[PDB]
Structure formats: C-alpha cells, structure tokens
Enzyme design. Structure first.
Site, PDB file in Angstrom:
ATOM      1  N   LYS B  59     -26.874  -5.817 -15.262  1.00 39.77           N
ATOM      2  CA  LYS B  59     -27.857  -6.474 -16.032  1.00 39.77           C
ATOM      3  C   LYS B  59     -28.510  -7.550 -15.427  1.00 39.77           C
ATOM      4  O   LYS B  59     -27.830  -8.492 -15.296  1.00 39.77           O
ATOM      5  CB  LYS B  59     -27.086  -6.690 -17.192  1.00 39.77           C
ATOM      6  N   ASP B  90     -32.456  -6.789 -19.234  1.00 33.46           N
ATOM      7  CA  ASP B  90     -32.085  -7.443 -20.679  1.00 33.46           C
ATOM      8  C   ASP B  90     -33.386  -8.262 -21.246  1.00 33.46           C
ATOM      9  O   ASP B  90     -33.242  -9.377 -21.381  1.00 33.46           O
ATOM     10  CB  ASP B  90     -30.931  -8.278 -20.469  1.00 33.46           C
ATOM     11  N   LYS B  92     -35.095  -7.606 -24.037  1.00 29.99           N
ATOM     12  CA  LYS B  92     -35.172  -7.695 -25.425  1.00 29.99           C
ATOM     13  C   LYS B  92     -36.573  -7.797 -26.105  1.00 29.99           C
ATOM     14  O   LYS B  92     -36.985  -8.778 -26.620  1.00 29.99           O
ATOM     15  CB  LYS B  92     -34.617  -9.145 -25.827  1.00 29.99           C
ATOM     16  N   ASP B  95     -41.621  -7.208 -30.000  1.00 36.47           N
ATOM     17  CA  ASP B  95     -43.037  -7.404 -30.484  1.00 36.47           C
ATOM     18  C   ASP B  95     -43.622  -5.734 -31.036  1.00 36.47           C
ATOM     19  O   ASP B  95     -42.802  -5.086 -31.058  1.00 36.47           O
ATOM     20  CB  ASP B  95     -43.887  -7.984 -29.241  1.00 36.47           C
ATOM     21  N   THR B  99     -48.076  -3.953 -27.892  1.00 38.07           N
ATOM     22  CA  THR B  99     -47.733  -5.355 -27.058  1.00 38.07           C
ATOM     23  C   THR B  99     -46.613  -4.764 -26.045  1.00 38.07           C
ATOM     24  O   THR B  99     -46.708  -4.885 -24.807  1.00 38.07           O
ATOM     25  CB  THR B  99     -47.354  -6.671 -27.792  1.00 38.07           C
ATOM     26  N   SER B 150     -23.577 -11.556 -30.341  1.00 33.16           N
ATOM     27  CA  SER B 150     -22.457 -12.269 -30.047  1.00 33.16           C
ATOM     28  C   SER B 150     -22.701 -13.718 -30.532  1.00 33.16           C
ATOM     29  O   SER B 150     -21.329 -14.543 -30.705  1.00 33.16           O
ATOM     30  CB  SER B 150     -21.966 -12.089 -28.688  1.00 33.16           C
ATOM     31  N   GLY B 228     -21.046 -12.008 -17.677  1.00 33.38           N
ATOM     32  CA  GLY B 228     -21.598 -12.942 -17.139  1.00 33.38           C
ATOM     33  C   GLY B 228     -20.761 -14.093 -16.411  1.00 33.38           C
ATOM     34  O   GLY B 228     -20.187 -13.713 -15.421  1.00 33.38           O
TER      35      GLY B 228
HETATM   36  O1  LIG Z   1     -25.543 -10.599 -28.268  1.00 39.71           O
HETATM   37  C1  LIG Z   1     -25.927 -10.666 -27.233  1.00 39.71           C
HETATM   38  C2  LIG Z   1     -26.951  -9.952 -26.365  1.00 39.71           C
HETATM   39  C3  LIG Z   1     -27.037 -10.454 -25.117  1.00 39.71           C
HETATM   40  N1  LIG Z   1     -26.112 -11.346 -24.380  1.00 39.71           N
HETATM   41  C4  LIG Z   1     -26.518 -11.596 -22.964  1.00 39.71           C
HETATM   42  O2  LIG Z   1     -25.092 -11.260 -22.466  1.00 39.71           O
HETATM   43  C5  LIG Z   1     -24.984 -12.306 -21.302  1.00 39.71           C
HETATM   44  C6  LIG Z   1     -23.741 -13.151 -21.568  1.00 39.71           C
HETATM   45  O3  LIG Z   1     -23.511 -13.825 -20.612  1.00 39.71           O
HETATM   46  P1  LIG Z   1     -21.908 -14.743 -20.490  1.00 39.71           P
HETATM   47  O4  LIG Z   1     -21.792 -15.442 -21.722  1.00 39.71           O
HETATM   48  O5  LIG Z   1     -20.895 -13.513 -20.315  1.00 39.71           O
HETATM   49  O6  LIG Z   1     -22.334 -15.636 -19.343  1.00 39.71           O
HETATM   50  C7  LIG Z   1     -26.258 -12.908 -21.351  1.00 39.71           C
HETATM   51  O7  LIG Z   1     -27.040 -12.746 -20.310  1.00 39.71           O
HETATM   52  C8  LIG Z   1     -26.826 -13.007 -22.505  1.00 39.71           C
HETATM   53  O8  LIG Z   1     -28.107 -13.070 -22.386  1.00 39.71           O
HETATM   54  C9  LIG Z   1     -25.094 -12.042 -25.197  1.00 39.71           C
HETATM   55  O9  LIG Z   1     -24.532 -12.807 -24.643  1.00 39.71           O
HETATM   56  N2  LIG Z   1     -25.111 -11.858 -26.563  1.00 39.71           N
HETATM   57  O1  LIG Z   2     -45.871  -9.893 -36.224  1.00 40.39           O
HETATM   58  C1  LIG Z   2     -46.299 -10.148 -35.657  1.00 40.39           C
HETATM   59  C2  LIG Z   2     -46.156 -11.194 -34.196  1.00 40.39           C
HETATM   60  C3  LIG Z   2     -47.111 -11.300 -33.334  1.00 40.39           C
HETATM   61  N1  LIG Z   2     -47.935 -10.348 -33.048  1.00 40.39           N
HETATM   62  C4  LIG Z   2     -48.824 -10.437 -31.828  1.00 40.39           C
HETATM   63  O2  LIG Z   2     -50.223 -10.721 -32.038  1.00 40.39           O
HETATM   64  C5  LIG Z   2     -51.482 -10.151 -31.571  1.00 40.39           C
HETATM   65  C6  LIG Z   2     -51.804  -9.176 -32.540  1.00 40.39           C
HETATM   66  O3  LIG Z   2     -52.986  -8.570 -31.799  1.00 40.39           O
HETATM   67  P1  LIG Z   2     -53.876  -7.559 -32.652  1.00 40.39           P
HETATM   68  O4  LIG Z   2     -53.309  -6.445 -33.505  1.00 40.39           O
HETATM   69  O5  LIG Z   2     -54.903  -8.593 -33.352  1.00 40.39           O
HETATM   70  O6  LIG Z   2     -54.853  -6.946 -31.400  1.00 40.39           O
HETATM   71  C7  LIG Z   2     -50.225  -9.433 -30.444  1.00 40.39           C
HETATM   72  O7  LIG Z   2     -50.434 -10.151 -29.221  1.00 40.39           O
HETATM   73  C8  LIG Z   2     -49.011  -9.122 -31.047  1.00 40.39           C
HETATM   74  O8  LIG Z   2     -48.088  -9.079 -30.111  1.00 40.39           O
HETATM   75  C9  LIG Z   2     -48.239  -9.216 -34.110  1.00 40.39           C
HETATM   76  O9  LIG Z   2     -49.146  -8.640 -34.039  1.00 40.39           O
HETATM   77  N2  LIG Z   2     -47.447  -9.579 -35.212  1.00 40.39           N
END
Ligand SMILES: O=c1ccn([C@@H]2O[C@H](COP(=O)(O)O)[C@@H](O)[C@H]2O)c(=O)[nH]1
Ligand SMILES: O=c1ccn([C@@H]2O[C@H](COP(=O)(O)O)[C@@H](O)[C@H]2O)c(=O)[nH]1
Ligand code: PRO
Ligand code: PRO
Lengths: 257, 257
Positions: B59, B90, B92, B95, B99, B150, B228
């Site tokens: 990851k 990862d 996440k 949007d 986007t 977590s 991690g």
């Molecule tokens: O709910 C979640 C989702 C993702 N991560 C990711 O998993 C890894 C956990 O790392 P560690 O706490 O084992 O170092 C990190 O990269 C973190 O961004 C979490 O810890 N919890």
């Molecule tokens: O709830 C949300 C949060 C953020 N954006 C962001 O706002 C912009 C909306 O663009 P448009 O639909 O006006 O082109 C994009 O950059 C989009 O990622 C949304 O549209 N809705």
C-alpha cells in the site's frame, strides 16, 4: 443581527485567514470562488490573471495539473497577491492524523507552502484536523470542513453534518468554515462555501447537482459560491465570472437588508 | 461454509483483480499488506524487494514520496511482478465523479497507470465509484470502499457502513472489497482489508487505534491486515513483516478450521 462581510472580518474570534478573505470580499464586492478545474498550468494562470479581479478565491485541484511544478504555484501566488484572492487547494484530506500531516506538508505538491486554505472530510474523526493543524497552525493556514456535499446520494447529512459543525467549533484556531450547501453554523466567524452552483438548473452525468447563486446565498444563507464548469466551459470566462459574481453579491446584499 | 482464499479466487462473481490477489495469498501463505509509509523512493523500493516475498500487497501514499517519478512506479511494478504482490494506492478518492476520474487517470501521479487497487470514501454517494470506474474498468483495475475507519471518532459506522456495503454490491464490476475493521459483507467475493493493526495494544497521538492480527482476522473475520509503523519503525523490517504474516495467516487458518 446579520453582519456584513466587512464587519464579520473584525469579529473577536475571527481567524486571520477568514478576516483577510472577508475584507477582500467586501473591498472587491465578490463572494465568488473560481473552481479552476483545468489540466494546463498556462490555462490556470491565464484564468487566475483575467478573473482575479472578479473572485475572492481560486480553488485548485493540483493533482489534475499535467504540468504541475512548485514554480507554477509561485506564479499563482504572485497573481493572488496582485489581484487579492486566496488560494484554496480542494485536497479533501480524509485519512488518519499521522498520514494527513505528511500529505499536507510534504511530497511533490508541498500544499501547505502555497495554499491559504485546504479542506478535510470529517469521517476519520477529529484526528484528521489535529494532524493538519500540526503543519497548518505554524504556517498560519486555515481549513474548511466538509459538512455537506452537492452530489446525488451524499451521506454528509443529519448527524454527520452536526458532527462536522461540532468538530469545526472545537478546532476554531485552524478551522475557518465549511464546504456546505447551506448555512450549517449559527456562529458568524465561520465561512460557508457552496459548490454545485450554476445559473441554469440541472447537473452532470456523474452525480453533480446544481442550484443557483440566488438559492444558495439568498435562501440557504451560504457566503461564497464555488463555480467550475459554469465559468470554465463558457466561451468568455471573464463575462461568465462577472455574471456569477453579480448574482452571488446581489443575493448577499438582499439577504443582509 | 467458509472457503479458503484459493477457493474464493474461483468464485463465479469474483473480480479478476480479487482472484489474482486471493491466488497469490494462498500460494505464498500471506494475508499481510505492507503500508509503505516512507518519504524516500529508495526506501520504498528496498522495502518492496526485501519484504515482497512476505506480503500479498504493498500500500502506497505516493503523495508523501519526496522524490516521486513515474520511473519509481515502473521499478515498483517490476518488484510486484517478481515477488507477486498487488500495488494499492491509498488515495481515498472522496470527490464528485467528474473530479475523481481526472484525479485517478491524470495529473503528475497517473495513479490508474500503476495501481492495481485504489480506494474511495462513500460520503459523496455512488458518483464517486461511477467516476472512478470510467477510468478503472477499461484498465482492468479494482477499487476498495472505505466502510469503517480505525481512528478515534470515526463516523464510518451504522447506516454509513451499510451504505458502503450496498454501494460495493451494486458496483461489483469494479469494487472488489472494503477497508473495514471487520467483515461487513456476507458475500465471499468481497475482500476485507483492515488497517489499525499492531501486535501490541495502543495507538498514536493523532487518533490511530490498534488491534491485533488475531483480533481482526480471527475474531472480526477480516481477510488482510494493513501494517505500517508496526513494521516500518522496527529495526529489522523483514523479521517484523514475517511476525505479522505468521500472525495473520494462522488467525485465518484457525477461523477456517
Ligand atoms: O481507517 C484507516 C484507513 C487507512 N489507514 C492507513 O493505514 C496506515 C496505518 O499505518 P500504521 O498506523 O500501521 O502506521 C496508514 O497509511 C493510514 O493512512 C488507517 O490507518 N486507518
Ligand atoms: O460537494 C462538493 C465538494 C466539492 N466539489 C468541487 O467543486 C467543483 C464543482 O465544479 P463544477 O460542477 O461547478 O464544474 C469541483 O472541483 C468539485 O470537485 C463539488 O462539486 N461538490
Ligand atoms: O430551478 C429553477 O427553476 C431556476 C431556473 C434557473 C435556476 N433556478
Ligand atoms: O489487547 C490485549 O490485551 C492484547 C495484548 C497484545 C495485543 N492484544
């Protein structure tokens, strides 16, 4: 007892980034945030220069910029200073605190070095804000929490939205407001920024839904409209920006009374 | 009627990326995903090479890599092919669909070009998955939905978790499973990957909470542990990876009976 943007800029509990923004909104008569959703640095900078006088804020997605460099962001800062607007990187930090602090400060983008504002999802709990504030507070930055989303099937509703408001109100040294569809906080120190805005009704084919500036500023009580395609896809982006600015500004004036 | 990883790899409705993963998990006797949370390309690649035989998956957070280039990801793919593990970015995605499709395909990172798996938050509604699948389906990629987190104060609970499972089960051509703390789907075609794992009790100072491999694989019914700092901060990362692999594998065997 609604205050003007200029008066809100002076509130005792105002964050300095929120104060700077509210003062330039009042000075320039703009509550428009351009969503500069382009893939070319030259188009980003040409839009920032031409539309700079019309906007309070330029929202970036630098992870879609095919030719990102830190020197592009230096040029964007020059335009932000010249025309007086804030830079908001719409990164949607959404990880545990330990991870988002590194994503904010480091890597290729060094977001904290050039973004006045960033935003975060509240789904991880308040550690997401604590992690960002470790980097953002020393760099005098601000953060927006995503309390509502514009898209079909959004789960940012009810108790989720209430949790975002509580998290903002408990991290007010760093959190300056919300991404929301409406006023979600009764505290006038918090900014409300609303995406999903166009002059015409409709949406897109991937769950975007639009409401008008009059609806979201006037009826729903938000402060700032975030507009992408309503401006970016128009032939004359300057005239489009001016139509959105005038719409959002008059809706604000009418609500203020 | 619980099936082995090798049998789950052959299920009629299995996604090809899930099938590839389940087959190499069975072949190598590993259900460990290394969370390679490092800032140096050389450390990422040296960990991938040394720990490759011990892991089913690596990851990444490429946005924390100070010296990211696409040539680093070419070298990582060489190691993934050699040692037989999947690459999971990862990112996440969180949007609107329009986007995230650009964030997945484009910009500097070109994530879809090298990541077997990515993940998405479900908070925007199903448009987030529809947008990603526009890029991911043609490139034969898979996606994980974040059903639980977590971290302290996580809002990914109750109806939110149920919404993530429904969204996965309605986009099964692209969604291959979940980030979760436990089994959340009764459908054996879905993978469950669990972060927040260490051998010792505790957490971090920014809301991370740890549970053991025996707890999350054995008692909570997850498939894969994501680790991690339990590995990365250890002096001997290979021996640490082997201790996590043996823990997760035996917990799986004991539950399977
Ligand atoms: O709910 C979640 C989702 C993702 N991560 C990711 O998993 C890894 C956990 O790392 P560690 O706490 O084992 O170092 C990190 O990269 C973190 O961004 C979490 O810890 N919890
Ligand atoms: O709830 C949300 C949060 C953020 N954006 C962001 O706002 C912009 C909306 O663009 P448009 O639909 O006006 O082109 C994009 O950059 C989009 O990622 C949304 O549209 N809705
Ligand atoms: O929804 C409506 O009917 C109006 C028409 C333009 C935008 N709002
Ligand atoms: O929580 C506990 O007590 C055990 C001790 C090591 C990890 N789990």
């Amino acid at each position: 007892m609604e205050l003007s943007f200029g008066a809100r800029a002076e509130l005792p509990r105002i964050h300095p980034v929120a104060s700077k923004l509210l003062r330039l909104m009042q000075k320039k008569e703009t509550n428009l945030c351009l969503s500069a959703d382009v893939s070319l640095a030259r188009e980003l900078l040409q839009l920032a220069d031409a539309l700079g006088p019309s906007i309070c804020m330029l929202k970036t997605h630098v992870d879609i910029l095919n030719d990102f460099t830190l020197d592009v962001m230096k040029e964007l800062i020059t335009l932000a200073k010249c025309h007086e607007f804030l830079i908001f990187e719409d990164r949607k930090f959404a990880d545990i605190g330990n991870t988002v602090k590194k994503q904010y400060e480091g890597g290729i983008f060094k977001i904290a070095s050039w973004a006045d504002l960033v935003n975060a999802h509240v789904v991880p709990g308040s550690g997401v804000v604590k992690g960002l504030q470790e980097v953002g507070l020393p760099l005098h930055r601000g953060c927006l929490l995503i309390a509502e989303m514009s898209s079909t099937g959004s789960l940012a509703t009810g108790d989720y939205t209430r949790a975002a408001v509580r998290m903002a109100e408990e991290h007010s040294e760093f959190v300056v407001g919300f991404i929301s569809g409406s006023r979600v906080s009764m505290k006038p120190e918090f900014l409300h920024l609303t995406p999903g805005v166009q002059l015409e009704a409709g949406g897109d084919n991937l769950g975007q839904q639009y409401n008008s500036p009059q609806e979201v500023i006037g009826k729903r009580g938000s402060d700032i409209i975030i507009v992408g395609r309503g401006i970016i896809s128009a032939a004359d982006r300057l005239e489009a920006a001016e139509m959105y600015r005038k719409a959002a500004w008059e809706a604000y004036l009418s609500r203020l009374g």
